[PDB]
Design a protein around this ligand. Structure first.
Ligand SMILES: [Ca+2]
Ligand SMILES: [Ca+2]
Lengths: 169, 125, 125, 169
C-alpha cells in the first residue's frame, strides 16, 4: 500500500509465495531452432551443427549453444506470464508506487552442462534481493533481482540471475 | 593461455536484418527489436539489439578464439548503452584470470554511443 | 456446401510485428518485409506482407470455415496491390464450384489500396 | 546477345540444360518450425499441433500445413541459389536486355498429399513458358513461368507454378 516499509513488507509477501511452478518449454531442444539461432548470431561453432565435430571437443553428439537456454522457454508471440511468476506482482507493486520506468542492468547466466537435442527444459522463477530506494542517473529507484532455474526433469542444468531497475523518470 | 592475453577483435554491423533476425531467433518478439515506430514511441532512437543476442555474441566471440573444445561455464553481462540500427559494435577481449584450468575473460562491446556491454566469461579448455 | 455459399469474413491488421513475424516464420529474409529503409529505397511505401504469408492466410481462411477435416488440394494466387504496414486486409469468400466432392472457393483479400490478392482454392470435405 | 529472336534462343538454351538437381531442405518437416508458422499466421487448425486431432480428420498424426511446403526449402539468411537453378540465368538475361524491373504476378501451388514431421523434402526447378514482349501498366515486359517440384525421396508431393514479369520501367 503506502510507503517504503510497506514496499519491503510487500516484497516479503511475494517471496513467501515461493518460486513459480516449473513451466515447460514449448519444444524440446531441437536442431531447427539451433540452426535459426546460429544462422542469425553468425556463430559457426561446429559442435552445434555436426555430430562428428561435437565429439572431438568431447561431447556425445551435437550440443545446443549454452546461451540458447533462455530461448527454449520464451513465452512467444502474445504469451502471458503465469500468475505465480513473481515478476508480475513486483512490477505492479513498483508501478503503483510511481516507479513507472524500467531498465535491465545485469544478466548473469550459469551453465551446469550442455544440453542435447531432444532434452526438454522447464523454468522456475524466484524473487531475490530487492534494494532501494537509490539515487541513479535515471532517477530514484529500486534494484530488483530475479533468480531463474532451468531443469531437465529434476536436474538443475542452468540458472540466471538478472537485475532490473524500477525508477521514477 | 596467459593472463593479459588479448583476443582477436570482432566488429559487427547492426543493420536492421541483423537486429530483427537475431531477436526473432532468440524468440524475443518485443516490438523494440523490430518495430521502429513502437521503439520511437517508447523513447528509443531506433530498434536495438536484444539482451539474448548480446549473450549469444559474447559466447561466440570467446569460442571464436578459444575454439570448439571450450566449455562455457558462465556468462555475466553488465548492460550499457543501446546498440541501435546502423551502429557498429566492436568486441575487444582480455584474459584476466587463469586458475585450476578455469579461464576468465573480460569482454567489452563498444559502439559510437560508448560501452554497449561488459561481460565476464568463465570457461574450460 | 453449395455454390454461392459465402464464407465468414476475416479482417487482419497488418501491424509491423505481424508483417515481420510472418515473413521470418516463412523463412523469407528479404529486407522488404522487415527493413523499412530498404523497402523505401527500393521504391515501396513501407514494409509489406510476403507472398508465402498470403498463401498461408488463404489456407487458414478456408480451413477456418471448412474445418479440420478439409484436405487442401491447391491454392492459386493472383497477386495485387501491396499490403503495407498498418493497412487492414479483409478476406471475403464465395463458393464457386461443387463437383465429385471437390470444392472450389474464390477468395479475395481487400485493403485500402484495393484488391491485395485473389485466390482460387480446391479442397476435399 | 542481341534482340527478341536471340532472347527466344537464349531461353531455349536455358531450358535445354534441364531442371536443377534436387536440393535438400535444411531440415526435415519439423514441429518447432510448424509451431513458429502457425503462431505467426494465427492458424489454430488442430491437426498441425495435436496428434489426436490429426486423426478425427483422417490423418496419421500431426501433419504440416500444406502452405508450408515452400518454407522447408527456403535458402535462408544470406543463401545463394545453385548454378543450375534456371531463375539465375533468366533474370540475368532480361536485366541485360534492359528489362531491369521485376514483380511476381501469379503463384499456384498443388499439394498431392500432406507431409509428416520427420519427412525431408527436396526441391527441383524448371523454366516454363516465356512470353513476350508485352505492353503492361509497368511498361514493356516478358512474363516468365517457373515450375517447381517438391519430392520426399522419389515421390512427387507438391508443385508450384509461378510467374514473374520482367519489365522496362
Ligand atoms: Ca544451479
Ligand atoms: Ca505433380
Amino acid at each position: 500500500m503506502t510507503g517504503v516499509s510497506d514496499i519491503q513488507e510487500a516484497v516479503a509477501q511475494i517471496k513467501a509465495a515461493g518460486p513459480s511452478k516449473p513451466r515447460l518449454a514449448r519444444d524440446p531442444v531441437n536442431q531447427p531452432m539451433i540452426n535459426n539461432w546460429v544462422e542469425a548470431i553468425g556463430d559457426r561453432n561446429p559442435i552445434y551443427v555436426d555430430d562428428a565435430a561435437a565429439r572431438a571437443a568431447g561431447h556425445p553428439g551435437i550440443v545446443a549453444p549454452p546461451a540458447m537456454i533462455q530461448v527454449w522457454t520464451m513465452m512467444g508471440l502474445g504469451g502471458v506470464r503465469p500468475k505465480d511468476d513473481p515478476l508480475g506482482p513486483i512490477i505492479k507493486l513498483f508501478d503503483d508506487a510511481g516507479y513507472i520506468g524500467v531498465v535491465a542492468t545485469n544478466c548473469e547466466q550459469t551453465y551446469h552442462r550442455y544440453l542435447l537435442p531432444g532434452e526438454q527444459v522447464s523454468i522456475s522463477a524466484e524473487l531475490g534481493d530487492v534494494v532501494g530506494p537509490k539515487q541513479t542517473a535515471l532517477g530514484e529507484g529500486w534494484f530488483i533481482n530475479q533468480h531463474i532455474v532451468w531443469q531437465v526433469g529434476d536436474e538443475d542444468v542452468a540458472e540466471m540471475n538478472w537485475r532490473i531497475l524500477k525508477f521514477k523518470p | 593461455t596467459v593472463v593479459g592475453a588479448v583476443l582477436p577483435e570482432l566488429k559487427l554491423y547492426g543493420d536492421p536484418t541483423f537486429i530483427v533476425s537475431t531477436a526473432l531467433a532468440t524468440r524475443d518478439f518485443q516490438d523494440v527489436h523490430h518495430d521502429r515506430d513502437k521503439a520511437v514511441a517508447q523513447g528509443s532512437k531506433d530498434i536495438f539489439v536484444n539482451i539474448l543476442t548480446d549473450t549469444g555474441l559474447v559466447q561466440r566471440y570467446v569460442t571464436d578464439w578459444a575454439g570448439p573444445s571450450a566449455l562455457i561455464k558462465s556468462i555475466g553481462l553488465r548492460l550499457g548503452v543501446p546498440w541501435y540500427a546502423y551502429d557498429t559494435v566492436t568486441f575487444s577481449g582480455e584474459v584476466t584470470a587463469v586458475n585450476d584450468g578455469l579461464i576468465t575473460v573480460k569482454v567489452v562491446g563498444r559502439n559510437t554511443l560508448g560501452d554497449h556491454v561488459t561481460a565476464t566469461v568463465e570457461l574450460s579448455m
